[PDB]
């Protein structure tokens, strides 16, 4: 799997209490979107690079790393039903056991779907590396 790049806008994050499920992500995305709309600020432009290794988030203006999210930390991803331009993932924090939903605004529903499908491929290919005791690449 070649690493795929998307240039999105970061809506923000909220904690969730379980790692997987649409009930969780739907409510998280509702919260994050309402907070971003009330912010009165333009969203940070972020680039996502998706591969079986995980998701690399970089600030688009500076190309500086925000976070390299290991594939083993990410439990779930979604193209949201209600807020259909939003792609989100849930991942456990690197530094403790808390679970965070991070949401990104795409230009179009089709892009949110493409990002979700690309992340699904990364989960599948990482799993296949894992089964044969190889490092995901």
């Amino acid at each position: 799997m070649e690493g795929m790049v998307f240039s999105l806008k970061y809506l923000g994050m909220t904690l969730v209490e379980r790692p997987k499920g649409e009930e969780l992500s739907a409510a998280a995305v509702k919260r994050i979107v309402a907070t971003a709309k009330a912010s009165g600020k333009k969203l940070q432009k972020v680039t996502l690079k998706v591969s079986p290794r995980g998701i690399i988030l970089t600030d688009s203006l500076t190309s500086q790393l925000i976070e390299n999210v290991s594939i083993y930390r990410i439990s779930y991803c979604t193209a949201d039903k209600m807020h259909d331009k939003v792609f989100a993932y849930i991942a456990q924090s690197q530094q403790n056991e808390s679970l965070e939903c991070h949401a990104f605004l795409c230009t179009k529903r089709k892009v949110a779907q493409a990002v979700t499908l690309t992340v699904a491929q990364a989960f599948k290919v990482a799993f296949e590396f894992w089964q044969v005791s190889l490092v995901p690449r």
Partner: peptide
């Protein structure tokens, strides 16, 4: 919605 669970979540040993 289109949604996916990661089968390798937390599968570090």
């Amino acid at each position: 919605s289109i949604n996916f669970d990661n089968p390798v979540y937390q599968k570090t040993t």
